[PDB]
Design a protein around this ligand. Structure first.
Ligand SMILES: Nc1ncnc2c1ncn2[C@@H]1O[C@H](COP(=O)(O)OP(=O)(O)O)[C@@H](O)[C@H]1O
Ligand SMILES: Nc1ncnc2c1ncn2[C@@H]1O[C@H](COP(=O)(O)OP(=O)(O)O)[C@@H](O)[C@H]1O
Ligand SMILES: Nc1ncnc2c1ncn2[C@@H]1O[C@H](COP(=O)(O)OP(=O)(O)O)[C@@H](O)[C@H]1O
Ligand code: BEF
Ligand SMILES: [K+]
Ligand SMILES: [K+]
Ligand SMILES: [K+]
Ligand SMILES: [K+]
Ligand SMILES: [Mg+2]
Ligand SMILES: [Mg+2]
Ligand SMILES: [Mg+2]
Ligand SMILES: [Mg+2]
Lengths: 525, 525, 525, 137
């Protein structure tokens, strides 16, 4: 199809307009006191929200080049959120600040390479200072405090998270489910987790979380590529009985069988979830065999000459609950008999004793840790049902926050860590008058989060920013109570990973947009 | 799809225009002497109404942003009506007054946060004063007078309501049905009510009330999630015989089964009503078993290994009449034999004697109260049929009014309670010159109901408002007779819940619109 | 359909506009530091790329004559890339330079014949000088260095390529496959390669490479033209069992059977790849028989009176892996037993001893070398999977580079060889004042690659070009480190075939455009 | 009459565009290998000239902000012709170069008055050096 092509400043102005529209819509919700955005709906009353993810989801522009700019910033913010677990609006704010200043500089006649170099060196220095500023969070008390803070001053949630990480290790697997009464019950079962997501996004039955959930499902353990429906039709017919879902774990499922399964799921004949087998090479079969032993199943591989046609319900495995994420699959409470679990664990342990390679033994300890660690289950108790659901959501968010906090520590919240590092780095210089303009652009953009937070609350950003810069350590401004104080003592924290990820991804997208020479899109016809 | 995005005053002006159109259309019907609105119809002659609910239902705007404003106000007015049982037009009037003044203030340069704070504190003070004014209505005589007033001076309606509440308790279940002759007959049967509405809005066969009604229906007591039609085809086939409706009470019905049932109901092959089982956790099965023993049925649960395929008409329960609301299900006159119900009551009573927790014994007290209280039935007698239907509607509205009156008491009607509180609070002050503008906005908007009532009747609002403010207590203006006097003695009352709900929801929507920074809607294409 | 016809300068201006748009979009990505081009996508976030092939693929123009110019340059650039393995962007840059200057000269009144003659003689002289500069690369050490350089300083890739070419000869067959662990394993099996591509482009299941890949496929060895499906239904029905793909190698497949096979592949019933038999005449049957012996099959020829209807799985051959390219078919690890292979080799060797013609014996040595050489397999080992895939792609590109390097040697990269030859040929003269304008146009366009590389890096092209011209030998500019030095020592090489092919194809397309008198296209309706 | 008001960078880019139009017309005639400019005259035949002030006195633009820029830069050539009788193309070239680099420095956040003071100091020192560098003729 015929294309529209733009070069140079003509492309830059369109990207700048799109970025400004997106960020202007999204940034008014930053902080604890964000303003309201009314999002229209096809039918009924609109949606009034203070969340930036929701606002960014429904932002689409009629002009194609401005739409390119908006989508470019949006997908980088999504990447930052995925990597860190939080920080979409902050990353968007940083990206807009850097992009606006840098594109103004480029339009004046400066060398884009020098600006990009200055921005990159400023960001690297800031990241080093951020590492210097961070304080470790590894002991139980700090973990509980971080959980309570992330649960909006809910001490029970932090208590449960601390108990779970003390039970199954801080690097283990934790899952939350619905409870029965008002009691928060925690228990340990046998399971494992491997990083393979669903093959198609059309299998998702929980759009609230964007994940696939199965209750007491059968699993097909095929060590081959699925190529024809005729191979799986008897298995599908057997699964249709008793009304139980089926989980497909095989080497790969290509177009025709994937389309058949997607159509079946949409019309609801049989609910099927498909996931690729973990790993590759000769270790993939070991991973699959460990899964089969955990779930008490049988591996169907062409090497043994086994056919999916002659497969009954016996060969399938059974698990209590299975959760499939975008890029992660969790198996919880397999029915595989436990003495067989001990026998397999002992066998691979003896293999470990025979390991002669560093990488090989590392993979073997990975396998034994996955197989013998188990998973932790936290059951949410409440009086009514809606509060139980929102409490479960709070527990999930607190788990995501606590994982990053344990990974890299915590820094003062409210946007004051970036102010600390920017005030530290005020002496940084570049080799060129254009690399100096880039260094000033990146350091000026670290005050944007706190300034926008104070602006949303309704005070004067300049006075509060000056007062915070004048202080030292964790001195900062509490937006909820409109008073100053030590941010740690007021319980306003951010994990270091969130801040670092947001800053780095904003700088990345800004550098990509600064050195862009052409944009090609379809005609507006 | 591409979106249109507006910021700031550009959004505020559009919301203001939409709110003005909606409220100007709806407020001319307020009071006993409202004017006429001519609503067009697809075919034939128009509809002429003095009711604001009907007028608000058919208001749409061609401009998208103004339509967002109108729908925003309409949805909050509907919330107020649902919470209090009455007060849609009053809530719309209060909301328009506050929104207009506050948006004018915001456009002039005042700070939205301070305005919202002033409005909120004025409303809280008004609510406290309204609680101060209210007088109790708990004894039988006051209940009878409130019922008579709510039934347009119909003493028989109040007599029946007072008898029913003295019979089955002021917090019991009361239902009204069609009678046989001219006699108003009241009787007590065995029944239960639980707060679970219909699964889909397409099951409603009575658009006049917006409720589902079933006569002698069978009930399916399934303690499992229903997902495949093949589980229920035999049961549906059995139900199709004898031409009796079926009510589904289960854990949940997912996409395809719900769609199949909706299609079957729409084409009328079998009339089916679907409703979710009450509660959750381990108590949900207790409630389901109590329902089963009430209606003489059998619980079909996968734990016992029972299948819906091998289910005949025997396992189903039978009830004389079942009514389903938007969020409430009522079962009247179950065929369950009384000795089984009494033995169940004794069993849970012995459980209560063994209760060791306050909230646990609270659930148990709720259960025994629901199971042993029963329901009251009021049968409407009249000479003709149209008169009987109109009297039944009057009885229903009187029941809704009397419930709120018992819950929170009564205050003088005609809009004079709000004048009383506004005149009381004339000394209230704020911390800022912008919080003072907010306080004056909220207190000035409390005279809007009485002024609009007097304007609709045809007098001068200012003279009557001044005369009423001059008085004290229950002194007020009768719009029907154009005469002053004591409101209580002339029988013009409002429940305190209606006034409080209208004021609070109006202030809520006004605060939402004041602090709105962006509006995103689809392109007009 | 009605056409639009343009003559002379009206056609030239449109072609010039199209060529300018294409080259302006594509050339900003040239070198190690090319800028970014944002390519819109139908859904989601755009594509940001620094690769000229991707940018050139998605360029279409709304104007039809300008689109002729763009497609004309694009197709010749693709030819150059196919012939040399690299040099699409460089060929585009050279073509644009020559075309622009030559068309400017033509529009002024100079004779197109003389301009074309001058350009042709300048290019021939440059090719001779480029042959003079080239340094041979045939010994193992130079091969290893060339492989390492082409693999981005990856010594293991070069080591593997050198080992493979030392095993199976520098003119042998090399194939890369996915490995198992982290070990790079190299082995030799029995196979052959013949230059026959897929019959239809719809059989390709690997759009990343644009090739057909089959795993353990059956092959149909038919020595006749296939035209009726009824001949080939039973064989496909047999093939559908066990879910194995089928490779069709016959004299030719006409419209009906090819369409049926394409439809079957598209809907995924049976995966079929079709290829024409190699050669022609009486040698074609000998080649087909050699393939059949290699794969342990049976030739189905009408001369023996064999029918495809009475063909079972026995007559088909089996191979471990088969790869089909655009114009090349590779058979790897046939199941043909080795003693039969040796007997066949001895038989054709005895035939060679009886050869009495030079060309005939040349065909016989071709046959024996292809039959007895075998193929080399290189297996890529890595830790993760994405790394393994990227490394395999790097190995493939290094193989393409090393083949050309062995074929013709290497010259200094960065565009300094063309500067060397242009500075050598500054004394060249033509017979006419119009042939002198053509000679200056061709020599001025040889500095365009280095100037564009330096422009993309951010320096001043004139100063760097002058410094490079002042030097001698392999002195040149390193764009990655912005430092001068000897190009060989910094490891910036470029095969002579790539440069020669790019220059020649650019001159060809320029000469075609210069002597073009008319352009016929469809109406814009 | 009614007026049009432009603030900041918009004004500066319009002004620089006008400066560039006039300077690009004038600068093609500089040196031993400069060329001629044909000037249309309402009364008579066109004049073919290689003089800087003759070309500069002729330029007027359609846009009014760009016309302001051109009208301001024209005074350099006018004054140079009035004072020395020669050297007007060189003056125009220098003025355009200074304006371009100064606007680049201003867009980087510098104070224009301090830049102006620095330019003045540099030019004063330069004139002293030029006086020191001459020889009698
Ligand atoms: N009470 C508070 N006072 C000041 N800043 C706060 C407070 N609570 C949270 N914050 C800060 O506000 C930010 C949260 O903004 P949010 O809307 O969550 O955007 P994001 O999704 O990008 O994190 C965090 O950086 C946090 O440090
Ligand atoms: N005879 C009367 N004189 C004065 N006011 C009255 C009289 N009867 C009812 N009202 C008042 O009119 C209001 C009823 O208006 P209505 O049209 O029902 O609006 P809504 O549905 O919002 O209550 C009540 O607040 C009531 O106090
Ligand atoms: N480090 C370097 N310094 C200078 N020139 C380089 C360097 N690396 C590669 N080149 C040159 O850049 C060219 C590669 O450009 P490329 O984007 O690959 O275009 P093409 O696809 O036409 O080869 C080669 O001619 C090579 O000689
Ligand atoms: F143009 Be100047 F007068 F030499
Ligand atoms: K928020
Ligand atoms: K009315
Ligand atoms: K490149
Ligand atoms: K001159
Ligand atoms: Mg957040
Ligand atoms: Mg009413
Ligand atoms: Mg290349
Ligand atoms: Mg002169």
């Amino acid at each position: 199809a015929a294309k529209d092509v733009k070069f140079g400043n003509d492309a830059r102005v369109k990207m700048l307009r799109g970025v400004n529209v997106l960020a202007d819509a999204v940034k008014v919700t930053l902080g604890p006191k964000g303003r309201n955005v009314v999002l229209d709906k096809s039918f009924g009353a609109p949606t009034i929200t203070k969340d930036g993810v929701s606002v960014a989801r429904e932002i689409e522009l009629e002009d194609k080049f401005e739409n390119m700019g908006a989508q470019m910033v949006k997908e980088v913010a999504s990447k930052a959120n995925d990597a860190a677990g939080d920080g979409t609006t902050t990353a968007t704010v940083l990206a807009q600040a850097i992009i606006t200043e840098g594109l103004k500089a480029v339009a004046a006649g400066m060398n884009p390479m020098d600006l990009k170099r200055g921005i990159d060196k400023a960001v690297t220095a800031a990241v080093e200072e951020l590492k210097a500023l961070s304080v470790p969070c590894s002991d139980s008390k700090a973990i509980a405090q971080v959980g309570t803070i992330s649960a909006n001053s809910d001490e029970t949630v932090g208590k449960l998270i601390a108990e779970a990480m003390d039970k199954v290790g801080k690097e283990g697997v934790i899952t939350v489910e619905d409870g029965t009464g008002l009691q928060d019950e925690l228990d340990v079962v046998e399971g494992m987790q491997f990083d393979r997501g669903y093959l198609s996004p059309y299998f998702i039955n929980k759009p609230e979380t964007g994940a696939v959930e199965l209750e007491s499902p059968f699993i097909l353990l095929a060590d081959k590529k699925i190529s024809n429906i005729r191979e799986m039709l008897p298995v599908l017919e057997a699964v249709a009985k008793a009304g139980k879902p089926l989980l497909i774990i095989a080497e790969d499922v290509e177009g025709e069988a994937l389309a058949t399964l997607v159509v079946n799921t949409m019309r609801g004949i049989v609910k099927v979830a498909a996931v690729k087998a973990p790993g590759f090479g000769d270790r993939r079969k070991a991973m699959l065999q460990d899964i089969a032993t955990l779930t008490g199943g049988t591996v169907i591989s062409e090497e043994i000459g086994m056919e999916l046609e002659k497969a009954t319900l016996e060969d399938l495995g059974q698990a209590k609950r299975v959760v499939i994420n975008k890029d992660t699959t969790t198996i919880i409470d397999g029915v595989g008999e436990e003495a067989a679990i001990q026998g397999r664990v002992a066998q691979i342990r003896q293999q470990i004793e025979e390991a002669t390679s560093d990488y090989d033994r590392e993979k073997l300890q990975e396998r034994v840790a996955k197989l013998a660690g188990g998973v932790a289950v936290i059951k949410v108790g409440a009086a009514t049902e809606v509060e139980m659901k929102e409490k479960k959501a709070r527990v999930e968010d607190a788990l995501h926050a606590t994982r990053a906090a344990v990974e890299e520590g915590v820094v003062a919240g409210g946007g004051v860590a970036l102010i600390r590092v920017a005030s530290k780095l005020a002496d940084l210089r570049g080799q060129n008058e254009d690399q100096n303009v880039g260094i000033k652009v990146a350091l000026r953009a670290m005050e944007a989060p706190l300034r926008q937070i104070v602006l949303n609350c309704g005070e004067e950003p300049s006075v509060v920013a000056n007062t915070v810069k004048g202080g030292d350590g964790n001195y900062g401004y509490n937006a909820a109570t409109e008073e100053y104080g030590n941010m740690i003592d007021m319980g306003i924290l951010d994990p270091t990973k969130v801040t670092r990820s947001a800053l780095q991804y904003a700088a990345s997208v800004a550098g990509l947009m600064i050195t862009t020479e052409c944009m090609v899109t379809d005609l507006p016809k």
